[PDB]
Design a protein around this ligand. Structure first.
Ligand SMILES: [Cu+2]
Ligand SMILES: [Cu+2]
Ligand code: NA
Ligand code: NA
Lengths: 80, 80
């Protein structure tokens, strides 16, 4: 069941403007719910505020598309 | 499990240009796979060919977003 969900999470995150791939995704079931931590790539010349905005947009996109996610943390790293 | 999938099918179909709602959706599991029949609404002033094109686009959209669907038939009815 988990691989199909992880595929949906990556696909959803990579559709958000400013995401330069999903660098890392760790998802685990807590019961029927998913809790996940994500690192996305961003343009190194983005501001820290812009990177924060992208992470928030990823959280909204992924949580809106995948109903079973009850916790999602998104961080950013420079990617070239 | 099925209600979440049916919600995804309707949401995916209603995002296609030319769809005037999902009129009917009957989904059933065959094993782990979903087989489904859908009726979408279309503009009565569309041509039959245009309606056929919309149905084909719905099939592509839904099957592309919901990996477990192994059979999907889409028909159209005039909706006002
Ligand atoms: Cu903020
Ligand atoms: Cu044709
Ligand atoms: Na900004
Ligand atoms: Na046409």
């Amino acid at each position: 069941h988990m691989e199909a969900v992880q595929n949906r999470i990556v696909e959803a995150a990579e559709r958000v403007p400013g995401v330069r791939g999903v660098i890392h995704l760790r998802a685990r079931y807590v019961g029927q719910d998913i809790w996940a931590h994500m690192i996305i790539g961003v343009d190194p010349e983005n501001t820290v505020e812009q990177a924060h905005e992208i992470c928030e947009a990823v959280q909204a996109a992924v949580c809106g598309k995948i109903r079973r996610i009850e916790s999602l943390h998104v961080s950013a790293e420079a990617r070239e």
